[PDB]
């Protein structure tokens, strides 16, 4: 995902998703107090100037929702960019511009990423490397890093 | 000049006692030694404005309901009920209580979108009672500073689109076609919808009390027609003395024939071509069903208009052929791809597909629900900016389906373990409850089957918890959706069956409409296998 | 500039402290003729001089004293 | 609006084509809509003489009126209504006035639990529950099983909010929806139902009872379940009014829970 | 009301005040500025000329405060 | 009350008749809606004695509590 982000010269960006539990934790929630915050993706583009760069998603594999509903339809909404032209919100009410972002996920189990979120996605299986291989890097980079 | 010639447009240019004082009064406060006080310089300016505002200048009227009927025959195709209110609007001004236009009776406002050429009607009215016809804009507009004008204490007093309305045309009735009135707001100096609260009513429209006009103008004999845009945005004192004038919309068969007929002329003459621009019927209904689906029919105005202006642009190159024979090959040359694929690919077999028929305040539309009833645990999420109409549609159809499970080899328990992420694309629909509830009930049923949707079908009607689909009004605007879909497949409910007979028959021939009632007998509709 | 167009501009406010003032204090002396038809309490009597002291503004023609013009009718 | 509007003694309307108007129109319980109505009467008929003065006095009545306005666009006289094997009539009162707010219920198979659709007092809600409780002593005379808050669920929906009146009027409305719902059996018709029930399962006397009457004639209902001390209230009511209004005089819910299920066959 | 004031010859000038979220909507303001109206009442009450016409009051129940200033 | 009711020697009322207007038609503790009983009961009276000055006392006891007044809540 480093070498795309290079390729489309688009801020890359680091986003995961484990642990989140409630569909306003994605959303934002009302301007009940002082200093409220909008929502999880339209705060996406607070460390970005621009609204398209590459912001990397991780770990859907941790997702349930012991909240009623699921977030898996407002990452179903970040399965189809111009479906987050129409994001439902809290503190901002914005539809956004925010169909320009370049996407790109992980999560390291594939079993357990929800059935809402287990279609139109293409296995990039990635392990590690071995002892030559590591043994190679390490005097390649790494000793030098 | 306009010192000796606005010195005798007073008092020969005949102009009415509430203008005529004011008229003299800048004849005194102006020619003093060519006075150069600021307010003289914008009142030289004033003056000028207060001449050549048409007055003893009226053209013959007619107080018969014979003659009000015919000439908005020549004006339009067909009035279903605007023709009833023109003429109650002659035959009884000439039997009401005061006999004159002297607002007593609702203006002829044209109520809702500017969706008709508004000039073109107040051409034929200025045909009508031998009068002249104006078009303003008050869009931009929500200020007294550009309703009426500025104080008269020092320069810089523009007057608004109402002076401006009653300069640039010629009769004491005219035909002012005041535009862009719905986007109206009270942002400074008090309240400007006031100001044509001043326009409207019959006590301040002849003591009209403007800024830029200090003596009360006389808007005594002044017709006046007005095309405001939207109808929730209009002021209270705007909606004092209100009758309504409805706008309807229009098939593709129907759009078609007007885009011959009604429409085609304007958008020619303004090009300046009349007769050299061919547009077939196949080149016709290939922009109509590709570029337009919306009931304005000045929205359908431009789609003609770029063509016009195109044809323009290769005539001045010169003329080589006296007609361009536009076939299928030069018709996506122009704007490249269309803005509408062709039909019955949105009705593609599809199991998340909802075709349907949806509400929207512009029109009749027809919305792709997207439905994903993944088995989860049973849990009801729900995205896309959606209200509480959305929820409350959505689990009286859920529930309706909790009533209606077995007849399709469903399992005995999906709310419990079938997580529906159902997202409307849009936000909410205003349309009651559910827009129509049984087409996101046959696109869950879709989703629940596992199984494709149907052909040429946009079904509409909401759902009850009865397991019924109660009668919905605004069955016009959803029938014309489905038309302009191509799509001639149409369910309603039994008393939406007897709005058929209440329908005019000239939108209802391109469709077939079947006879449901309850929301189990749409669902059967949508799907291309029967299980 | 400002001199100048405040000289043409002092000539409007002569014509107002003679001829618009007077107007204006007219449709003030028919309101105060209405105050003597129906009979104002005094203290209201009282309260149309002090926005009349309000008003009365030989000086300008302001927006205080239209809106006093208003309040005093 | 014959002096007013141009139409000086040119048309006669009956009452009975004045009826049609309000009954399939404009059901308000006041007469602005309605004089909306009279006055759209009176445009639409105003536009016919004067094309040829075929009669100096146009009789209009049930049989010419749709063609200058149409057809039932609402049921007249609502004391017929849709066939109640789930439901009943609404009889509500709002700040316009007469509701038929027809209780939508959908009496489930689930775990018994409750599911509540539309602007909706939890109140309205716990008297909904009262009512069950009412029938949870009434399962198997009422042709039920026994077993229905452990395994039959509950959703409801009442138009818009459920009574506009905080407490509910439409207490026993719901309360009949849900018995219908319950029994798939038709709640009979004319009957329009206002009042609640207690946790002892009576219809206790309501308050805003002339409302409900109100609403009952305006719909063209004329069979009202009411409680006894409304019965005592409702003498102190001008009679003109309680023309056209069979009242049942209950305290209790039964009362009405043994009325409109007759055809539980 | 119009019946009342044809009673007790008086007059009959109605008067709505609905909708208002001002106290200085239903009162008036301060002379020291423009953009200063004064209440639908006080202008209300300009037309007539007798201190007792049936003035009539719309709809207490449909107003709220939203502004400084209680408008009831 | 029948003095500030203006309602002088007009109407006879006794305990009894207060009893059962207490006793049935408001069960406010303290003098709230008791006042507003007794100016309804004077309220009653006063318009009874605006169609006559017929007797010197207006009998209202316990048994006519519901013909000066509507039903016992």
């Given at each position: 995902?480093?070498?795309?982000?290079?390729?489309?010269?688009?801020?890359?960006?680091?986003?995961?998703?484990?642990?989140?539990?409630?569909?306003?934790?994605?959303?934002?929630?009302?301007?009940?107090?002082?200093?409220?915050?909008?929502?999880?993706?339209?705060?996406?583009?607070?460390?970005?100037?621009?609204?398209?760069?590459?912001?990397?998603?991780?770990?859907i594999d941790?997702?349930?929702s012991?909240?009623?509903?699921?977030?898996?339809?407002?990452?179903?909404?970040?399965?189809?960019?111009?479906?987050?032209?129409?994001?439902?919100?809290?503190?901002?009410?914005?539809?956004?511009?925010?169909?320009?972002?370049?996407?790109?996920?992980?999560?390291?189990?594939?079993?357990?990423?929800?059935?809402?979120?287990?279609?139109?996605?293409?296995?990039?299986?990635?392990?590690?490397?071995?002892?030559?291989?590591?043994?190679?890097?390490?005097?390649?980079?790494?000793?030098?890093? | 000049?306009?010192?000796?010639?606005?010195?005798?447009?007073?008092?020969?240019?005949?102009?009415?006692?509430?203008?005529?004082?004011?008229?003299?009064?800048?004849?005194?406060?102006?020619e003093?030694?060519?006075?150069?006080?600021?307010?003289?310089?914008?009142?030289?300016?004033?003056?000028?404005?207060?001449?050549?505002?048409?007055?003893?200048?009226?053209?013959?009227?007619?107080?018969?309901?014979?003659?009000?009927?015919?000439?908005?025959?020549?004006?339009?195709?067909g009035?279903?009920?605007?023709?009833?209110?023109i003429?109650?609007?002659?035959?009884?001004?000439?039997?009401?209580?005061?006999?004159?236009?002297?607002?007593?009776?609702?203006?002829?406002?044209?109520?809702?979108?500017?969706?008709?050429?508004?000039?073109?009607?107040?051409?034929?009215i200025?045909?009508?009672?031998?009068?002249?016809?104006?078009?303003?804009?008050?869009?931009?507009?929500?200020?007294?500073?550009?309703?009426?004008?500025?104080?008269?204490?020092?320069?810089?007093?523009?007057?608004?689109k109402?002076?401006?309305?009653?300069?640039?045309?010629?009769?004491?009735?005219?035909?002012?076609?005041?535009?862009?009135?719905?986007?109206?707001?009270?942002?400074?100096?008090?309240?400007?919808?006031?100001?044509?609260?001043?326009?409207?009513?019959?006590?301040?429209?002849?003591?009209?009390?403007?800024?830029?006009?200090?003596?009360?103008?006389?808007?005594?004999?002044?017709?006046?027609?007005?095309?405001?845009?939207?109808l929730?945005?209009?002021?209270?004192?705007?909606?004092?003395?209100?009758?309504?004038?409805?706008?309807?919309?229009?098939?593709?068969?129907?759009?078609?024939?007007?885009?011959?007929?009604?429409?085609?002329?304007?958008?020619?003459?303004?090009?300046?071509?009349?007769?050299?621009?061919?547009?077939?019927?196949?080149?016709?209904?290939?922009?109509i069903?590709?570029?337009?689906?919306?009931?304005?029919?000045?929205?359908?105005?431009?789609?003609?208009?770029?063509?016009?202006?195109?044809?323009?642009?290769?005539?001045?190159?010169?003329?080589?052929?006296?007609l361009?024979?536009?076939?299928?090959?030069?018709?996506?040359?122009?704007?490249?791809?269309?803005?509408?694929?062709?039909?019955?690919?949105?009705?593609?077999?599809?199991?998340?597909?909802?075709?349907?028929?949806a509400?929207?305040?512009?029109?009749?539309?027809?919305?792709?629900?997207?439905?994903?009833?993944?088995?989860?645990?049973?849990?009801?999420?729900?995205?896309?900016?959606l209200?509480?109409?959305?929820?409350?549609?959505?689990?009286?159809?859920?529930?309706?389906?909790?009533?209606?499970?077995?007849?399709?080899?469903?399992?005995?328990?999906?709310?419990?373990?079938?997580?529906l992420?159902?997202?409307?694309?849009?936000?909410?629909?205003?349309?009651?409850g559910?827009?129509?509830?049984?087409?996101?009930?046959?696109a869950?049923?879709?989703?629940?089957?596992?199984?494709?949707?149907?052909?040429?079908?946009?079904?509409?009607?909401?759902?009850?918890?009865?397991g019924?689909?109660?009668?919905?009004?605004?069955?016009?605007?959803?029938?014309?959706?489905?038309?302009?879909?191509?799509?001639?497949?149409?369910?309603?409910?039994?008393?939406?069956?007897?709005?058929?007979?209440?329908?005019?028959?000239?939108?209802?021939?391109?469709?077939?409409?079947?006879?449901?009632?309850?929301?189990?007998?749409?669902?059967?509709?949508?799907?291309?296998?029967?299980? | 500039?400002?001199?100048?167009?405040?000289?043409?501009?002092?000539?409007?406010?002569?014509?107002?402290?003679?001829?618009?003032?007077?107007?204006?204090?007219?449709?003030?002396?028919?309101?105060?003729?209405?105050?003597?038809?129906?009979?104002?309490?005094?203290?209201?009597?009282?309260?149309?001089?002090?926005?009349?002291?309000?008003?009365?503004?030989?000086?300008?023609?302001?927006?205080?004293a239209?809106?006093?013009?208003?309040?005093?009718? | 609006?014959?002096?007013?509007?141009?139409?000086?003694?040119?048309?006669?309307?009956?009452?009975?084509?004045?009826?049609?108007?309000?009954?399939e129109?404009?059901?308000?319980?006041?007469?602005?809509?309605?004089?909306?109505?009279?006055?759209?009467?009176?445009?639409?008929?105003?536009?016919?003489?004067?094309?040829?003065?075929?009669?100096?006095?146009?009789?209009?009545?049930?049989?010419?009126?749709?063609?200058?306005?149409?057809?039932?666009?609402?049921?007249?006289?609502?004391?017929?209504?849709?066939?109640?094997?789930?439901?009943?009539?609404?009889?509500?009162?709002?700040?316009?006035?007469?509701?038929?707010?027809?209780?939508?219920?959908?009496?489930?198979?689930?775990?018994?639990?409750?599911?509540?659709?539309?602007?909706?007092?939890?109140?309205?809600?716990?008297?909904?529950?009262?009512?069950?409780?009412?029938?949870?002593?009434?399962?198997?005379?009422?042709?039920?099983?026994?077993?229905?808050?452990?395994?039959?669920?509950?959703?409801?929906?009442?138009?818009?909010?459920?009574?506009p009146?905080?407490?509910?009027?439409?207490?026993?409305?719901?309360?009949?929806?849900?018995?219908?719902?319950?029994?798939?059996?038709?709640?009979?018709?004319?009957?329009?139902?206002?009042?609640?029930?207690?946790?002892?399962?009576?219809?206790?006397?309501?308050?805003?009872?002339?409302?409900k009457?109100?609403?009952?004639?305006?719909?063209?209902?004329?069979?009202?379940?009411?409680?006894?001390?409304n019965?005592?209230?409702?003498?102190?009511?001008?009679?003109?009014?309680?023309?056209?209004?069979?009242?049942?005089?209950?305290?209790?819910?039964?009362?009405?829970?043994?009325?409109?299920?007759?055809?539980?066959?």
């Amino acid at each position: 995902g480093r070498s795309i982000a290079r390729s489309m010269n688009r801020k890359f960006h680091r986003i995961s998703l484990g642990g989140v539990r409630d569909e306003a934790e994605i959303r934002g929630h009302r301007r009940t107090y002082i200093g409220a915050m909008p929502g999880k993706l339209i705060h996406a583009m607070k460390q970005v100037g621009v609204i398209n760069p590459v912001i990397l998603l991780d770990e859907i594999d941790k997702m349930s929702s012991d909240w009623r509903g699921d977030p898996a339809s407002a990452m179903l909404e970040v399965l189809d960019p111009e479906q987050n032209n129409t994001f439902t919100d809290h503190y901002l009410d914005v539809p956004y511009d925010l169909s320009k972002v370049f996407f790109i996920t992980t999560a390291n189990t594939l079993q357990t990423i929800p059935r809402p979120l287990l279609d139109r996605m293409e296995v990039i299986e990635i392990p590690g490397y071995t002892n030559m291989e590591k043994q190679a890097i390490a005097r390649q980079y790494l000793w030098p890093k | 000049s306009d010192l000796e010639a606005l010195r005798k447009k007073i008092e020969e240019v005949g102009m009415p006692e509430a203008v005529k004082t004011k008229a003299l009064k800048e004849l005194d406060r102006l020619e003093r030694m060519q006075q150069g006080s600021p307010e003289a310089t914008v009142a030289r300016t004033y003056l000028d404005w207060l001449t050549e505002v048409p007055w003893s200048k009226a053209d013959p009227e007619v107080l018969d309901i014979n003659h009000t009927r015919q000439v908005l025959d020549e004006d339009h195709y067909g009035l279903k009920d605007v023709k009833e209110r023109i003429l109650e609007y002659l035959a009884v001004r000439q039997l009401t209580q005061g006999l004159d236009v002297r607002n007593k009776a609702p203006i002829l406002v044209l109520v809702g979108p500017p969706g008709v050429g508004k000039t073109s009607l107040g051409r034929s009215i200025a045909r009508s009672m031998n009068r002249k016809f104006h078009r303003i804009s008050l869009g931009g507009v929500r200020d007294e500073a550009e309703i009426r004008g500025h104080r008269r204490t020092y320069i810089g007093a523009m007057p608004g689109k109402l002076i401006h309305a009653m300069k640039q045309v010629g009769v004491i009735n005219p035909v002012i076609l005041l535009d862009e009135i719905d986007k109206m707001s009270s942002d400074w100096r008090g309240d400007p919808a006031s100001a044509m609260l001043e326009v409207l009513d019959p006590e301040q429209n002849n003591t009209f009390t403007d800024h830029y006009l200090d003596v009360p103008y006389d808007l005594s004999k002044v017709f006046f027609i007005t095309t405001a845009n939207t109808l929730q945005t209009i002021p209270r004192p705007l909606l004092d003395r209100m009758e309504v004038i409805e706008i309807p919309g229009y098939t593709n068969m129907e759009k078609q024939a007007i885009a011959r007929q009604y429409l085609w002329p304007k958008q020619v003459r303004e090009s300046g071509m009349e007769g050299r621009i061919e547009v077939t019927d196949a080149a016709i209904l290939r922009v109509i069903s590709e570029y337009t689906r919306e009931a304005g029919v000045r929205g359908l105005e431009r789609e003609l208009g770029k063509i016009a202006r195109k044809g323009a642009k290769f005539w001045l190159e010169g003329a080589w052929e006296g007609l361009r024979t536009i076939d299928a090959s030069d018709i996506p040359t122009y704007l490249g791809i269309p803005r509408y694929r062709p039909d019955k690919a949105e009705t593609e077999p599809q199991v998340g597909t909802a075709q349907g028929l949806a509400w929207t305040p512009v029109g009749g539309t027809l919305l792709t629900i997207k439905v994903a009833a993944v088995p989860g645990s049973g849990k009801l999420s729900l995205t896309g900016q959606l209200g509480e109409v959305m929820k409350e549609s959505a689990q009286a159809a859920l529930t309706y389906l909790r009533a209606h499970t077995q007849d399709y080899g469903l399992p005995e328990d999906f709310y419990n373990k079938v997580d529906l992420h159902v997202h409307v694309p849009d936000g909410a629909t205003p349309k009651d409850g559910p827009s129509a509830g049984i087409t996101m009930a046959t696109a869950i049923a879709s989703a629940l089957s596992r199984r494709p949707a149907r052909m040429d079908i946009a079904m509409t009607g909401e759902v009850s918890l009865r397991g019924k689909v109660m009668p919905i009004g605004g069955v016009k605007e959803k029938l014309l959706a489905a038309h302009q879909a191509g799509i001639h497949k149409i369910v309603l409910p039994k008393d939406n069956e007897a709005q058929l007979e209440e329908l005019p028959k000239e939108v209802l021939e391109g469709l077939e409409i079947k006879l449901v009632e309850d929301v189990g007998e749409v669902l059967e509709y949508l799907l291309l296998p029967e299980p | 500039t400002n001199q100048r167009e405040s000289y043409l501009r002092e000539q409007m406010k002569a014509i107002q402290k003679e001829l618009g003032g007077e107007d204006g204090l007219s449709d003030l002396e028919a309101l105060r003729k209405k105050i003597e038809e129906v009979g104002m309490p005094e203290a209201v009597k009282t309260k149309a001089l002090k926005e009349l002291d309000r008003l009365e503004r030989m000086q300008q023609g302001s927006p205080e004293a239209t809106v006093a013009r208003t309040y005093l009718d | 609006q014959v002096r007013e509007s141009g139409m000086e003694g040119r048309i006669e309307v009956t009452d009975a084509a004045i009826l049609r108007v309000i009954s399939e129109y404009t059901r308000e319980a006041g007469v602005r809509g309605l004089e909306r109505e009279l006055g759209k009467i009176a445009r639409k008929g105003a536009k016919f003489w004067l094309e040829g003065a075929w009669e100096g006095l146009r009789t209009i009545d049930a049989s010419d009126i749709p063609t200058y306005l149409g057809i039932p666009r609402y049921r007249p006289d609502k004391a017929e209504t849709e066939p109640q094997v789930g439901t009943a009539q609404g009889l509500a009162w709002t700040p316009v006035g007469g509701t038929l707010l027809t209780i939508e219920v959908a009496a489930v198979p689930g775990s018994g639990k409750l599911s509540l659709t539309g602007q909706l007092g939890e109140v309205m809600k716990e008297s909904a529950q009262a009512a069950l409780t009412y029938l949870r002593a009434h399962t198997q005379d009422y042709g039920l099983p026994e077993d229905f808050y452990n395994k039959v669920d509950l959703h409801v929906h009442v138009p818009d909010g459920a009574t506009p009146k905080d407490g509910p009027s439409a207490g026993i409305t719901m309360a009949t929806a849900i018995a219908s719902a319950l029994s798939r059996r038709p709640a009979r018709m004319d009957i329009a139902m206002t009042g609640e029930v207690s946790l002892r399962g009576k219809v206790m006397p309501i308050g805003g009872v002339k409302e409900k009457l109100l609403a009952a004639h305006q719909a063209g209902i004329h069979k009202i379940v009411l409680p006894k001390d409304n019965e005592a209230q409702l003498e102190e009511l001008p009679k003109e009014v309680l023309e056209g209004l069979e009242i049942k005089l209950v305290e209790d819910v039964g009362e009405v829970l043994e009325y409109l299920l007759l055809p539980e066959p």
